[PDB]
């Protein structure tokens, strides 16, 4: 009677070289119940189990999807296993590729110079990323950033400013106080969603 219920759903939640597979738990999951995560790469009709018995709701497939930004995408599936019983597989509903990666920025460096706030956006440099596969290398054109500025002695209201370079300037036309900025990345021709970076501030004078 090997007919355990199958995981309700399986999907990826990835960021640059952080390709994580997520799936919901099977109703009535026991303590001796685990999940088998298999991976298939487009262009080669063949599945390969990455993990036979994982007692988790997620699995990092990064080590096995390094050529994601140089491939035609992968497909993924997870199935529940309890000793000798195991459900049917639940596979991702779309091809996993560069398209589905969320854009994030590593950090923003602010500086002040003659009434200017000079900003430098440091894209992510994940260690797992093979040398020549930089954010810049992969997303070679139309990189854009939404800049949200707020004055500390001001409030929780923000003013926007879009830029097309990893460097940007904002003029401090004779202003005093503290300026905090957040950055949201995107690629003009793409649909990849991006996430706001931790706010960074800098003080004008003393």
């Amino acid at each position: 009677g090997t007919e355990l219920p199958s995981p309700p759903s399986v999907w990826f939640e990835a960021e640059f070289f952080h390709h994580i597979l997520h799936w919901t738990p099977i109703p009535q999951q026991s303590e001796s119940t685990c999940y088998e995560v298999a991976l298939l790469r487009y262009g080669i009709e063949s599945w390969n189990s990455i993990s036979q018995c994982s007692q988790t709701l997620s699995y990092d497939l990064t080590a096995v999807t390094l050529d994601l930004y140089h491939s035609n995408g992968y497909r993924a599936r997870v199935r529940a296993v309890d000793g000798s019983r195991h459900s049917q597989w639940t596979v991702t509903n779309t091809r996993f590729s560069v398209d589905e990666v969320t854009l994030t920025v590593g950090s923003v460096n602010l500086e002040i110079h003659n009434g200017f706030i000079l900003g430098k956006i440091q894209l992510p440099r994940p260690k797992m990323a093979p040398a020549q596969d930089t954010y810049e290398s992969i997303f070679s054109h139309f990189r854009e950033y939404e800049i949200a500025i707020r004055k500390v002695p001001g409030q929780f209201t923000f003013t926007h400013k879009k830029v097309k370079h990893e460097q940007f300037s904002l003029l401090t036309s004779g202003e005093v106080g503290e300026f905090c900025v957040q950055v949201k990345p995107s690629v003009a021709s793409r649909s990849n969603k991006g996430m706001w970076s931790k706010e960074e501030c800098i003080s004008l004078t003393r």
Partner: protein
């Protein structure tokens, strides 16, 4: 640099195509076939300009229309994509540099041959030696 010629003009439409493709993606990439039709080299190289045009026409003329018959509940999205893809195609034509660079040389030759009182017949036969050398050189380059 004419507008239709620079890549930046296609950014927004390329992006639209993709967001629309994102809402219907799970339905379209639901099949069981995990083979790759449009491989990584399909549009690279000398032949690229030509293949690209063929893919565009293929999709615009044969596949999308075929789609309404297979994914009825998606006609809205499919009509949109086929419409943006279309805006993109015509636009790419306005730009010579985006197409195949094989019509210009034929233009010159034909033109220069027409500006002759006998249409180049004379110039043509006197260059037979030249032709044979170009031919022989052409064969060793392939």
């Amino acid at each position: 640099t004419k507008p239709q010629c620079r890549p930046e003009d296609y950014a927004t439409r390329l992006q639209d195509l993709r967001v629309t493709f994102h809402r219907v993606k799970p339905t379209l990439q639901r099949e069981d076939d995990y083979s790759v039709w449009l491989d990584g080299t399909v549009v690279k190289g000398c032949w690229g300009c030509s293949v690209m045009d063929w893919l565009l026409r293929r999709y615009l003329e044969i596949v999308f229309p075929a789609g309404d018959h297979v994914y009825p509940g998606l006609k809205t999205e499919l009509h949109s994509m086929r419409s943006t893809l279309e805006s993109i195609y015509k636009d790419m034509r306005q730009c010579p540099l985006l197409g195949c660079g094989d019509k210009s040389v034929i233009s010159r030759l034909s033109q220069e041959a027409e500006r002759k009182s006998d249409n180049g017949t004379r110039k043509g036969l006197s260059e037979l030696d030249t032709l044979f050398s170009r031919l022989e050189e052409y064969l060793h380059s392939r």
